[PDB]
């Protein structure tokens, strides 16, 4: 398009700008405190409707009483005073959606806080909308590669499911999310739209310094071009932390309804319950068990239930949710964690013991489970993933006998050693996602027992050297595993012969 | 003509201001001007011509003063064969997109349970194809059945297997009421029944009804959609003396939904935050699910155990109403045994030497005593080991593990997860297989073969095959 043609269309667009104003009812605030504003009059106001105060900050009318109206301040409530004016906008809470959202950082309401420039978007969707029915949904049959060996192998995540990243503080909950975003960057560069996955990161009750560090990492790896960050910090009012999850969820429905694939990552929801509890307690509502409101279960259920795999009739889009939960002392019997577990499909348990013992990612495969199961894994993965689980199951049992000692059968020594190779194999550093095909090769060598030869401390370095060696000399093999997604017999023979050979060539500690 | 009008809207609770002729409690009110049909169930009369109701749909978009129409009757849902093979909403709307539902008449979801004089209780063994169930906790046709399980223990897959084994080949009709569960499972079950020919588009077929109150529905709807499914079963029971198979998904969501609004309703929280009317609210539902002179209902209802805490008031009160109980244990799943049916906790009212054959009762207790003894030996074995035990204890531990591993049975619904085709076990083969193990028929062969097998013969043939293989 020539510069002149675009400018003419640009001028014509500015010409066609309409602005209509109608009579809008307004009311006075009876009282204001802790962000709650009691408004007098202001009748014929809809629940959840947006209202604007004198200063210009917005509000949401939640409690509609015959006497007054309970409004929540969507911002700083220092300027609010008794008798101030409250104007109803006439529209339910909504946020901007579109493709321009990618590459920016917004707040709970959707305003960009990066400071780059105004948001150029024209589509706005309501924050809270009824989830899809039963027919629009569809069975999850597409893998969502996170880049982690243990996850992509033991706990496969299919696009359209709900996996719970549950763990204690500083247990690697955020590390898992970051590794996933970094893994999807490769698929974004290559022209494979069927595997592009837009990432959405919802930050609820987190220090801005940490979120700032988070965004820098994305830009460092150039993974921010397809990432959306919603920020609801601690200083932000409780309603913002309450709406930020639903706000980001609405942005995901855009890609979902448009046949696209989007990944939304909800940070710690316990912080949302505190804000939602705080917001409910200040409204003088009767509290429930643990001081939380009675409908706290409906809160997360309504939010997570929206993530689904739309059918081909609507475009085949999908929305994947990865809610996070922080535990106090690893007690999953609490009220909030128990509810979230029953809502999501699978859950990833993080153990502090495994973390300090060198098992990073500290994943407890014994408890982790996924409804989709092998239905998401690729052909080359299901075959190897099956035996991997069984081998690890036996190793966890013989762990105690090691203390008993005083004797060890030949087979038990092998099974004990074999399992040690897998645990050492599944370990992975931070900010180091692996390709799906590369994991197949490494995981294959482990179950076959080849790793039992070299010393355990050398298995981790062998992984790097082995993969690099394959990428250079054996490139057609990797291409077949990627394109076809199946481990053919010809690849088995070739792979089964080069794995023992390579170990002998390279300089490693062969003594078991 | 609308008599009432919206006056107060907070969360899911909505109050209506009537001018005269207040509607009776439990009546269904129609709000006019809403984008979607909203129904309000009268629950309390607060005086001054005021009534407090619960909204079945999202209250967002409502407006104070909006006219409300009084129907004069509780929420009525379509009943009859037209609902068979179709998904229906809490208020009776078809959400399957297959068109309107044809019903010969409309019945109310609220009714008094049948009297005691016309109870007509009866016991009849129900061969479900599961050896562990048919042996330790036999089910009774026309009696309540409970599946107590935690979060992610295998109770949903078990319900699917019972449907695949019990619902099909059933002369009578069947009803499936899924309340509070995730919607993904609903779409899977719908496609499963369609592929399995349990439901079809061709009229005169699909002898099975589906009702869904999934999480996507707001409070109040999940607590009353269960009554909708029950009304369908009641119609097939009273109008026709046909055995009805009522497959109720997790019911804990019903009592939970009531507590979600009990606080706003004005009730004082209970010891664990539940409503004071938990026993009465739950009792009204259980008493209605029972066999009568007209027809019988074999209800298969699951109870979700939050945090694996069986002391919760909701499930604790349910045990008293259930005839057969199936408590799922998480320890078994860790071992790989499926179905993870707890043999000691699971009980059945039919487990009586007079009701069932003495041989069936004998083999049942023989397994329970065997496993109970093995559980006690675990303590000493941890320190000293099985070697330090006596020959008598060694044999007990040996057979106990073989029987415990043999309880595992792969079903058709578990093929996708395990990859082994399902299998059906008869009652005769079931009692004979375990009875032989109790006598030591399989004590010689390794315990590895007594895993995920249907019959004892299958395990022996597999054992011999492994021998020639090596």
């Amino acid at each position: 398009l020539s510069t002149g043609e675009a400018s003419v269309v640009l001028a014509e667009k500015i010409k066609g700008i309409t602005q209509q104003n109608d009579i809008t009812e307004y009311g006075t605030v009876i009282s204001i405190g802790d962000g709650i504003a009691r408004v007098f009059g202001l009748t014929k106001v809809q629940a959840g409707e947006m209202v604007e105060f004198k200063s210009g900050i917005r509000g949401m009318a939640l409690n509609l009483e015959t006497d007054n109206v309970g409004v929540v301040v969507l911002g700083n409530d220092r300027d609010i005073k008794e008798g101030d004016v409250v104007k109803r906008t006439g529209a339910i809470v909504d946020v901007p959606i579109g493709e321009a959202m990618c590459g920016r950082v917004f707040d709970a309401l959707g305003n960009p806080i990066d400071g780059l420039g105004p948001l150029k978007t024209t589509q706005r969707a309501r924050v809270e909308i009824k989830a899809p029915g039963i027919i629009p949904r569809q069975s999850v049959r597409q893998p969502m590669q996170t880049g982690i060996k243990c996850v992509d192998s033991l706990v496969p995540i299919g696009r359209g499911q709900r996996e719970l990243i549950i763990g204690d503080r500083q247990t690697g909950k955020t590390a898992i999310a970051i590794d996933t975003i970094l893994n999807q960057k490769e698929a974004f560069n290559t022209g494979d739209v069927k595997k592009q996955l837009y990432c959405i990161y919802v930050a609820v009750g987190q220090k801005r310094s940490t979120i700032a560090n988070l965004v820098s990492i994305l830009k460092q790896h150039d993974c921010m071009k397809f990432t959306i960050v919603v920020c609801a910090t601690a200083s932000d009012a409780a309603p913002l932390q309450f709406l930020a999850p639903y706000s980001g969820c609405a942005i995901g429905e855009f890609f979902r309804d448009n046949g696209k694939h989007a990944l939304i990552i909800y940070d710690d929801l316990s912080k949302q319950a505190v804000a939602y509890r705080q917001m409910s307690l200040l409204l003088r509502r009767p509290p429930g068990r643990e001081a939380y409101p009675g409908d706290v279960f409906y809160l997360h259920s309504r939010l997570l239930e929206r993530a689904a795999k739309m059918n081909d009739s609507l475009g085949g889009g999908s929305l994947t949710a990865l809610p996070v939960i922080e535990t106090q002392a690893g007690d999953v019997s609490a009220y909030i964690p128990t509810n979230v577990i029953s809502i999501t499909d699978g859950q990833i348990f993080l153990e502090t013991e495994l973390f300090y013992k060198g098992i990073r990612p500290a994943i407890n495969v014994g408890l982790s489970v996924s409804r989709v199961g092998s239905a998401a894994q690729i052909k080359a993965m299901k075959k190897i993933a099956g035996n991997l689980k069984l081998t690890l199951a036996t190793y966890r049992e013989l762990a105690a006998f090691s203390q008993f000692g005083s004797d060890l059968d030949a087979k038990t020594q092998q099974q004990l050693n074999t399992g040690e190779r897998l645990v050492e194999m599944l370990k992975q550093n931070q900010y180091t996602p692996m390709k799906v095909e590369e994991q197949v090769c490494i995981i294959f060598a482990g179950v076959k027992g080849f790793l039992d030869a070299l010393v355990t401390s050398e298995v981790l370095k062998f992984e790097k050297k082995f993969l690099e060696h394959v990428r250079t000399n054996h490139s057609a093999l990797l291409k077949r595993i990627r394109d076809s997604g199946d481990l053919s017999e010809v690849d088995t023979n070739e792979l089964n012969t080069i794995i023992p050979l390579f170990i002998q060539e390279g300089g490693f500690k062969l003594k078991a | 003509k609308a008599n009432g009008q919206v006056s107060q809207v907070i969360g899911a609770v909505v109050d209506v201001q009537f001018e005269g002729e207040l509607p009776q409690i439990l009546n269904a009110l129609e709000v006019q001007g809403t984008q979607h049909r909203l129904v309000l169930e009268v629950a309390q009369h607060l005086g001054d011509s005021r009534v407090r109701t619960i909204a079945m749909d999202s209250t967002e978009g409502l407006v104070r003063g909006q006219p409300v129409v009084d129907t004069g009757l509780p929420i009525s849902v379509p009943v009859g064969p037209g609902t068979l093979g179709r998904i229906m909403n809490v208020i009776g709307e078809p959400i399957d997109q297959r068109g309107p539902i044809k019903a010969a008449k409309l019945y109310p979801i609220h009714r008094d349970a049948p009297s005691f004089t016309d109870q007509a209780t009866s016991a009849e063994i129900l061969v479900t194809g599961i050896k562990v169930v048919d042996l330790l906790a036999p089910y009774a046709r026309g009696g309540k059945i409970g599946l107590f399980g935690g979060a992610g223990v295998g109770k949903t897959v078990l319900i699917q297997e019972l449907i695949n084994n019990v619902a099909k080949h059933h002369g009578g009709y069947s009803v499936f009421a899924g309340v509070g569960e995730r919607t993904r499972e609903g779409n899977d079950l719908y496609h499963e029944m369609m592929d399995s020919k349990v439901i079809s588009v061709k009229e005169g077929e699909s002898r099975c009804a589906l009702i869904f109150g999934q999480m996507n529905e707001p409070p109040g709807a999940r607590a009353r959609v269960g009554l909708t499914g029950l009304t369908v079963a009641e119609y097939f029971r009273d109008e026709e003396g046909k055995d009805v198979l009522l497959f109720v998904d997790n019911i804990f969501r019903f009592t939970q939904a009531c507590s979600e609004v009990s606080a706003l309703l004005g009730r004082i929280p209970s010891a664990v935050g539940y409503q004071p009317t938990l026993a009465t609210d739950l009792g009204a539902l259980q008493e209605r699910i029972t066999t009568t002179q007209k027809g019988s209902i074999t209800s298969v209802q699951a109870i979700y155990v939050p945090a694996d805490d069986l002391t919760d008031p909701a499930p604790a009160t349910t045990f008293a109403h259930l005839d057969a109980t199936t408590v799922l244990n998480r320890g078994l799943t860790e071992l790989g045994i499926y179905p993870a049916v707890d043999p000691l906790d699971s009980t059945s009212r039919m487990l009586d030497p007079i009701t069932i054959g003495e041989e069936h009762y004998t083999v049942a207790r023989g397994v329970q005593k065997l496993l109970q003894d093995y559980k006690s030996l675990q303590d000493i074995i941890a320190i000293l080991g099985v070697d330090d035990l006596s020959e008598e204890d060694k044999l007990v531990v040996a057979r106990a593990r073989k029987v415990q591993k043999f309880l595992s049975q792969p079903f058709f619904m578990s093929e996708v997860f395990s990859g082994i085709p399902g299998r059906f076990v008869n009652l005769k083969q079931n009692i004979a297989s375990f009875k032989a193990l109790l006598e030591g028929a399989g004590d010689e062969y390794p315990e590895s073969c007594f895993y995920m097998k249907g019959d004892l013969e299958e395990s022996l043939a597999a054992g011999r095959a492994d021998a020639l293989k090596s």
Binding site: - | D309, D379, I383, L384
Partner: peptide, 27 residues
């Protein structure tokens, strides 16, 4: 502090002390 967990660990120590006390008799 999660009474259910404490009561389980107390049960374990009781069995250990029991079997430990029994082995003393045999000793």
């Amino acid at each position: 502090a999660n009474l259910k967990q404490l009561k389980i660990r107390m049960k374990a120590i009781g069995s250990i002390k029991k079997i430990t006390k029994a082995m003393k008799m045999v000793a």
